[PDB]
Amino acid sequence: GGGGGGGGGG
Amino acid sequence: ARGSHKAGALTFSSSLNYAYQKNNFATTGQGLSMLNSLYQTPRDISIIG
Amino acid sequence: DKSTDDTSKVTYFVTLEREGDEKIVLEKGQPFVEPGYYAEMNGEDITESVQIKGSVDVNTPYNLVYAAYNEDGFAKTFTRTVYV
C-alpha cells in the first residue's frame, strides 16, 4: 500500500 | 590479474577479478534504532554518561 | 576533549512505614499515645529523625503529620488525624 509511520511518546 | 598476449594476427587477453566486502550497519528507522533513540534525548541529559 | 560528562548525584530515599490507624478518635481527657512509626534510609534506621508536625489537644473537642528527610531534602510523609 503506502507504508505507515508512528507517533511517539510524551 | 589482467594480461594480454599477441602472437599473430591473433591477440588474446583476459581480465579476472575477485572482490570481497563485509559491511555492518547502524540501522535507522522509527523503531528502537540508534539515531531515532539518540535524537529523542532532553537537552539537559548527558548522553556519554 | 569531550565536554558533557554526567554530573548526577545518586540520592537515597527514606522509607517510612506506619503503625496503627490513620484516623483515631478519643474521649475528652483520654490521653494521646504515639502508635509508633518506622523510618529507613539506605538501610540505616533513622526513626528518631522523624518529625511530627502539630499536636492533639485532648481537652478541646486534630491532625498530625510524620515526615522523614534524607540527606538531600527528599521526604516521605503520612498523616494521622485524631478527633475528640
Automatic annotation (TrEMBL), chain B:
Domain of life per record: Bacteria
Localisation per UniProt entry: Cell outer membrane
Family listed: Belongs to the TonB-dependent receptor family.
Protein name: Outer membrane protein Omp121
Organism (species): Bacteroides thetaiotaomicron (strain ATCC 29148 / DSM 2079 / JCM 5827 / CCUG 10774 / NCTC 10582 / VPI-5482 / E50)
Residues of the full protein shown: 297 to 345 of 984
From TrEMBL, chain C:
Location of the Pesticidal crystal protein Cry22Aa Ig-like domain: 17-84
Organism in which the protein naturally occurs: Bacteroides thetaiotaomicron (strain ATCC 29148 / DSM 2079 / JCM 5827 / CCUG 10774 / NCTC 10582 / VPI-5482 / E50)
Transmembrane segments: none
Entry protein name: DUF5012 domain-containing protein
Shown residues in whole-protein numbering: 20 to 105 of 230
